[PDB]
RNA sequence: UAAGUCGACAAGAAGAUGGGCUUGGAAGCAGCCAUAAUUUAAAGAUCUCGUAACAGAGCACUUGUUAAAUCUUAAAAGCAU
């Protein structure tokens, strides 16, 4: 039968109960954002779900139209326009910048079985990570000069992130311009072509999002910051100029 | 009021409270709820 | 207690004079606990209270601030007399600065209001008396409290004023423990805002 | 806090800067309808390079006219101070 | 020759505008994969399994270890780190963004139970 | 507050009527005019075809009506061939669980869901999960779904 | 339990859908049966009201604000009311 020391090989001790969803959902956090490179936060003023869904419904429309015929993988349905908890998504940068996994030391651990076999726990909620934020956490001045500190006043309030899978230019400005518009880089649609875009709904839930930052391969980025990333028609083919240099 | 020997809550509103309790008094533990007055109940006799 | 913590912010005018451990002999009692008296002077008048001596107030004239701190919180004493004293610091502070004042609304037909001077009842020269024609068969005149102005806008409007919160709105209670709101037509005396709820038919 | 009786808000502030998080949390405490009521907003977000002094504007339906600092006190002292002309203009009508 | 509808049958009751006919079926190859796999979510005796169900099993879990036997603790529970990985890859990006919407279920699934429950009581 | 209102009527058939009159001639707004608006609106649709609509009546009593598609239990019975009962419209299973009235295929529900499609608030969704959100719908009306 | 406990406060609480049956009417909420799914920060074919029936107000549920550095909630036991 198993013994009291056995722990369950995909339950190792974590820093607090994992039942729970703050504990559940910082999980999530810590892998959006090594799987997510291209993120945009917004910022929402409490939308209701019709108007969340009829923004929803014009970056769908809007993404839709990106030429991609060069056979690559379908990244048009995983952009997800997500509200996340402030609070435990200010963790999660953290554990990615103050948490190194290499330093952890590996111990024996009991199977169902009772044998001693050698184990590191390194995941997210473990008590290691825990205290390594914790201490970094502790010196003021010198985390404003990391990535995080530099997204500190980012992460007050209720904020709504927009997860691209990849760094796609082509994918940007079809989601800047239907979220913040700024013509003649980003112009918003035509009213003759979309008319979805102009809607009683619609046009009352664009007012209330509001892009004050982007964070772009671990890196924060100005909002002016954004529009020179967008300017660029394409990744691949802006390399291409350089070598003809 | 009702003047039960088994008071209980009815309702969310409804709260526990001892009044009455003076120098001369111990007071009786009361019922009172604000939202529906029929809730209002006793425990104790003078 | 969690408002004890918070520090009172001293507006531009008033002025708080903590005075020093005193005891009033009491020939009944064969010891009491020494208190503190407090005065917070301002444009509009000047409260006073004593508080137990366990109570430190950390008044700090430089940010104009004073934050309470108790002895021991382990005492239910301590706990209790500690939020209450702040209670009552917040009010002084926002009584004897803005002032405190209390609205009173007539519903009923035939519920009217005025503001005379009754001089056969004068407890303080100068009294007001607040004339009510509440559908009774005598008439309901109650003087004004000293320290309290009483005035009526409009027939149905009563608006009473003064710096003791504990003393306005005790007088408010007076003015409406002659007419009681019914649940029936929402006749009766409503005190800031108070409101019944009425039946289906 | 009350937003009824707020005609006209403009804020201009820098994101990076802590000293704007004031500013920014009085932006959110703004109801969804304030938009359909008609009241007029504006926000213009300074650049990163150089950041000038955060300025917050405030107007009530009287025509008076408010303007704080938003480096030297901080979000909930705006609030005190909002709420009071709000609170008077209410014991007024009634 | 999967679908029990063949190419032409006549598809009834589903055209409301006037100047069109009802829609005709096209063929089956034409017709999105993902509509061949959306159909997988649809789910005296007592003594006769008795003598067999309850043998039968013990005869094939052949309960002499105890790894088969662990509690299998679900997903919605366990605290390992999502397959994620920094600079992974598009392929490692998509595969790592598939268990987070996989948890996302399991999570709902445990919302449903505990909202029943609590409105049963 | 701009109430709303819930009322079936006919593709053709706008009217003062018990499905028409009572839903919004109480309230104060000029029926006589909705029925000839409405008119406009439908003329492309079998005469007395359902059409559910979400009037607003918004303050002064203006009223815009927002015309929707045909219900989607009123398809699935259409759809599936089922035998006319009471009302002179075609009935659904009186016990979902054990009664089936027709056998609705797969070729039948991605049609379904594209007509549900033209709805502009329902035109975000995607079809892939559009067409499960029916198949959902056929356990309730006693459908059985064949591959 | 600073990954903000507890209380209060602000908003949200999607869609197919007015589930089918039922009844003069039954639209989450007379009753009968079903109640796998879907999409979301979340949201029961519905826990307490409410309507002739709709509508409408809360809850479960979800985010934010304030704010605890031995200070959260429950059970049992001792002694009292
Ligand atoms: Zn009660």
């Known amino acids: 039968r198993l013994p009291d020391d056995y722990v369950p090989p995909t339950?190792?001790?974590?820093?607090?109960?994992?039942?729970?969803?703050?504990?559940?959902?910082?999980?999530?956090?810590?892998?959006?954002?090594?799987?997510?490179?291209?993120?945009?936060?917004?910022?929402?003023?409490?939308?209701?779900?019709?108007?969340?869904?009829?923004?929803?419904?014009?970056?769908?429309?809007?993404?839709?139209?990106?030429?991609?015929?060069?056979?690559?993988?379908?990244?048009?349905?995983?952009?997800?326009?997500?509200?996340?908890?402030?609070?435990?998504?200010?963790?999660?940068?953290?554990?990615?910048?103050?948490?190194?996994?290499?330093?952890?030391?590996?111990?024996?651990?009991?199977?169902?079985?009772?044998?001693?076999?050698?184990?590191?726990?390194?995941?997210?909620?473990?008590?290691?990570?825990?205290?390594?934020?914790?201490?970094?956490?502790?010196?003021?001045?010198?985390?404003?000069?990391?990535?995080?500190?530099?997204?500190?006043?980012?992460?007050?309030?209720?904020?709504?992130?927009?997860?691209?899978?990849?760094?796609?230019?082509?994918?940007?400005?079809?989601?800047?311009?239907?979220?913040?518009?700024?013509?003649?880089?980003?112009?918003?649609?035509?009213?003759?072509?979309?008319?979805?875009?102009?809607?009683?709904?619609?046009?009352?839930?664009?007012?209330?999002?509001?892009?004050?930052?982007?964070?772009?391969?671990?890196?924060?980025?100005?909002?002016?910051?954004?529009?020179?990333?967008?300017?660029?028609?394409?990744?691949?083919?802006?390399?291409?100029?350089?070598?003809?240099? | 009021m009702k003047v039960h020997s088994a008071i209980k809550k009815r309702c969310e509103h409804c709260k526990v409270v001892r009044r009455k309790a003076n120098k001369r008094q111990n007071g009786y533990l009361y019922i009172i709820c604000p939202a529906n007055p029929r809730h209002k109940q006793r425990q104790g006799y003078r | 207690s969690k408002l004890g913590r918070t520090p009172l912010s001293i507006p531009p005018g008033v002025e708080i004079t903590i005075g020093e451990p005193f005891v009033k002999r009491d020939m009944t009692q064969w010891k009491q606990q020494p208190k503190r008296?407090?005065?917070?002077?301002?444009?509009?008048?000047?409260?006073?209270?004593?508080?137990?001596?366990?109570?430190?107030?950390?008044?700090?004239?430089?940010?104009?601030?004073?934050?309470?701190?108790?002895?021991?919180?382990?005492?239910?004493?301590?706990?209790?007399?500690?939020?209450?004293?702040?209670?009552?610091?917040?009010?002084?502070i926002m009584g004897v600065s803005e002032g405190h004042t209390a609205v009173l609304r007539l519903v009923g037909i035939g519920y009217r209001a005025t503001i005379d001077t009754r001089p056969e009842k004068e407890e303080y020269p100068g009294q007001q008396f607040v004339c009510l024609k509440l559908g009774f068969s005598h008439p309901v005149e109650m003087g004004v409290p000293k320290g309290m102005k009483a005035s009526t806008p409009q027939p149905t409007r009563i608006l009473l004023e003064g710096i003791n919160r504990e003393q306005v709105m005790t007088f408010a209670a007076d003015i409406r423990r002659w007419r009681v709101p019914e649940p029936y037509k929402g006749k009766g005396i409503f005190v800031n805002g108070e409101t019944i709820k009425l039946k289906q038919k | 806090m009350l937003t009824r009786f707020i005609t006209d808000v403009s804020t201009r502030f820098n994101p990076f800067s802590a000293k704007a998080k004031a500013a920014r949390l009085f932006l959110s405490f703004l109801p969804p309808n304030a938009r359909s009521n008609g009241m007029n907003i504006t926000t213009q977000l300074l650049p990163r390079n150089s950041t000038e002094t955060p300025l917050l504007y405030v107007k009530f339906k009287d025509g008076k006219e408010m303007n704080l600092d938003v480096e030297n006190m901080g979000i909930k002292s705006i609030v005190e101070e909002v709420d009071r002309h709000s609170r008077i203009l209410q014991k007024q009508a009634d | 020759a999967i679908s029990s509808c063949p190419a032409g049958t006549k598809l009834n009751g589903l055209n409301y505008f006037k100047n069109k006919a009802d829609p005709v079926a096209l063929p089956d190859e034409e017709?999105?994969?993902?509509?061949?796999?959306?159909?997988?979510?649809?789910?005296?005796?007592?003594?006769?399994?008795?003598?067999?169900?309850?043998?039968?099993?013990?005869?094939?879990?052949?309960?002499?270890?105890?790894?088969?036997?662990?509690?299998?603790?679900?997903?919605?529970?366990?605290?390992?780190?999502?397959?994620?990985?920094?600079?992974?890859?598009?392929?490692?990006?998509?595969?790592?963004?598939?268990?987070?919407?996989?948890?996302?279920?399991?999570?709902?699934?445990?919302?449903?139970?505990?909202?029943?429950?609590?409105?049963?009581? | 507050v701009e109430q709303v209102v819930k009322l079936i009527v006919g593709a053709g058939q706008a009217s003062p009527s018990p499905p028409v009159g009572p839903a919004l001639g109480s309230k104060g707004?000029?029926?006589?005019?909705?029925?000839?608006?409405?008119?406009?609106?439908?003329?492309?649709?079998?005469?007395?075809?359902?059409?559910?609509?979400?009037?607003?009546?918004?303050?002064?009593?203006?009223?815009?009506?927002?015309?929707?598609?045909?219900?989607?239990?009123?398809?699935?019975?259409?759809?599936?061939?089922?035998?006319?009962?009471?009302?002179?419209?075609?009935?659904?299973?009186?016990?979902?669980?054990?009664?089936?009235?027709?056998?609705?295929?797969?070729?039948?529900?991605?049609?379904?869901?594209?007509?549900?499609?033209?709805?502009?608030?329902?035109?975000?969704?995607?079809?892939?999960?559009?067409?499960?959100?029916?198949?959902?719908?056929?356990?309730?009306?006693?459908?059985?779904?064949?591959?």
């Open chain 1, 11 to 245: 339950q190792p001790p974590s820093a607090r109960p994992v039942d729970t969803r703050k504990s559940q959902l910082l999980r999530t956090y810590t892998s959006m954002l090594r799987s997510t490179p291209l993120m945009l936060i917004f910022q929402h003023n409490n939308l209701t779900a019709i108007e969340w869904a009829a923004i929803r419904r014009e970056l769908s429309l809007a993404l839709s139209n990106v030429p991609v015929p060069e056979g690559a993988p379908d990244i048009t349905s995983k952009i997800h326009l997500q509200v996340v908890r402030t609070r435990i998504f200010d963790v999660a940068l953290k554990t990615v910048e103050f948490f190194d996994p290499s330093t952890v030391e590996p111990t024996t651990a009991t199977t169902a079985t009772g044998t001693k076999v050698p184990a590191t726990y390194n995941h997210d909620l473990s008590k290691h990570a825990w205290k390594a934020v914790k201490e970094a956490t502790k010196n003021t001045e010198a985390v404003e000069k990391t990535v995080y500190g530099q997204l500190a006043p980012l992460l007050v309030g209720p904020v709504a992130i927009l997860t691209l899978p990849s760094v796609s230019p082509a994918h940007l400005g079809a989601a800047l311009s239907v979220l913040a518009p700024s013509p003649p880089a980003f112009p918003a649609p035509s009213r003759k072509k979309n008319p979805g875009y102009y809607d009683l709904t619609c046009q009352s839930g664009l007012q209330k999002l509001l892009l004050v930052g982007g964070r772009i391969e671990g890196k924060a980025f100005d909002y002016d910051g954004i529009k020179w990333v967008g300017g660029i028609e394409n990744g691949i083919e802006g390399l291409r100029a350089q070598l003809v240099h």
């Open chain 5, 31 to 121: 017709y999105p994969e993902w509509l061949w796999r959306c159909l997988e979510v649809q789910k005296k005796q007592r003594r006769l399994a008795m003598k067999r169900a309850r043998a039968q099993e013990a005869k094939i879990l052949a309960s002499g270890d105890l790894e088969a036997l662990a509690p299998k603790i679900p997903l919605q529970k366990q605290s390992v780190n999502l397959p994620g990985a920094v600079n992974g890859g598009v392929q490692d990006a998509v595969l790592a963004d598939e268990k987070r919407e996989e948890l996302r279920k399991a999570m709902r699934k445990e919302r449903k139970a505990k909202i029943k429950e609590s409105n049963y009581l």
């Open chain 3, 37 to 92: 008296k407090i005065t917070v002077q301002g444009p509009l008048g000047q409260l006073e209270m004593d508080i137990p001596d366990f109570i430190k107030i950390d008044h700090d004239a430089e940010a104009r601030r004073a934050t309470l701190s108790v002895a021991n919180r382990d005492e239910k004493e301590q706990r209790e007399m500690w939020g209450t004293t702040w209670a009552y610091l917040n009010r002084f």
């Open chain 6, 29 to 147: 707004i000029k029926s006589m005019d909705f029925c000839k608006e409405f008119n406009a609106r439908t003329a492309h649709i079998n005469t007395g075809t359902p059409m559910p609509v979400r009037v607003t009546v918004r303050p002064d009593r203006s009223f815009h009506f927002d015309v929707r598609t045909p219900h989607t239990s009123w398809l699935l019975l259409n759809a599936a061939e089922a035998p006319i009962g009471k009302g002179g419209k075609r009935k659904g299973a009186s016990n979902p669980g054990k009664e089936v009235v027709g056998t609705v295929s797969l070729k039948h529900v991605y049609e379904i869901a594209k007509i549900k499609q033209s709805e502009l608030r329902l035109s975000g969704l995607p079809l892939e999960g559009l067409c499960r959100a029916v198949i959902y719908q056929a356990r309730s009306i006693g459908i059985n779904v064949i591959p």
